[PDB]
C-alpha cells in the first residue's frame, strides 16, 4: 500500500517518521499487510487550506492492492485519524482520508508488474 | 472535495492563498459544494516539466464525491484556467486539469467515512 | 499523460531535469503520446518510506487518457525502474509504480476538455 499524508503542520524529521511509523503499523494490521509493501510519506504544505483558512489540516490518501471496503476504511480512519491528533495536534474535523483500489495490473515492483 | 495545484510557478504564500480562494470559490459555484467541504492546496514544485520544458506549468488535479461530469467540467476547466493565468501568469496551454470522482464509502472526515 | 515521481533521493535540479527528460522519451515510445502532451515531476520528499524505513526510494505515478494495458505497463515498469536505477542509484526492489487510466471527458487543457464526445 501507499499512503500519501499531506499537512500544512510542520514538526520535525524524527517527529514526522515517528507518526508514519505509526500509521504504517495500523495499516499493516487492518490490511494483513507487511511492513514490507508499505509506502508512507509526510509532505509539508505551508500553504495547504481546509474549510477556507490555513488552520492545522491533514490529508491522507491511501493507495492499495485490494483491502478496500467499508470494514477496513472505517477501521482505518478511525485509526489513522486517531494518530494524526495526537502526534500532530490536528482537529479531527481537520482531517479528510482518501481511499483507492489499485488493480494488481497497473502496479509494479521492482521493475515488473504485481499481476 | 480535493483541489490540488502543482506548479513551478512562484508566488508568495498570500498570493497563492489568494488564488486558492478563487478556485474553491469557482469549485462552489460549479458542483453547488461550500467551502466548508473543500480542500486546497498549492504545491511549488520547481522541477515541474511539461512539453519537454520547465517553462511555467500548472497542472491541477480536482477530486469530488459526485459532480464529476461534461457539464460541470467543461465549466471548471475554463473557469480554473483563467483564475491561474490571472493570478500565476500562466499560458492556458501550459494548463493541466484532471477530474477525479471518489466514493464515499471511499472517502472519510473527523475519523468517519462519508457514506452511509 | 502526467508523470509523478516522488523520492528522498537528492539530486542536483540539472540532474533531476535530465532524468524526467528521459522518463518522458519512454512515456512517449511507449504509449504513442507526443513529449507535448507529457508532464513529468520530480518531487523530493525527505522523510518518504518504504518497507519500514527511509533509505533510497522512488515511487512513480503515471497518469494517462488510454494505453494503460498489461503490454505497455510492463514495457514502461521496465524502462523506467532502468533511468531510476541508472540516474538516481536507487535499487530497483526500492521502486513503486502506479499506472492510472483517466477519460478524455475528465481532462482539460487550455481550458477545454480533452476528446470530442
Known amino acids: 500500500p501507499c499512503c500519501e499524508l499531506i499537512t500544512n503542520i510542520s514538526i520535525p524529521d ?6 508514519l511509523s505509526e500509521i504504517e503499523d495500523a495499516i499493516s494490521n487492518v490490511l494483513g499487510k507487511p511492513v514490507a509493501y508499505i509506502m508512507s510519506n509526510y509532505d509539508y504544505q505551508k500553504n ?20 478496500i471496503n467499508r470494514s477496513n476504511n472505517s477501521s482505518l480512519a478511525d485509526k489513522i485519524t486517531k494518530i494524526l491528533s495526537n502526534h500532530l495536534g490536528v482537529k ?5 482520508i482518501e481511499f483507492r483500489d489499485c488493480s494488481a495490473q497497473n502496479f509494479a515492483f521492482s521493475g515488473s508488474l504485481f499481476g
Open 92 to 96: 479531527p474535523r481537520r482531517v479528510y
Open 14 to 19: 524524527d517527529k514526522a517518521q515517528n507518526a
Open 48 to 67: 495547504l487550506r481546509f474549510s477556507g483558512s490555513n488552520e492545522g489540516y491533514c490529508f491522507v490518501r491511501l493507495t492499495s492492492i485490494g483491502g
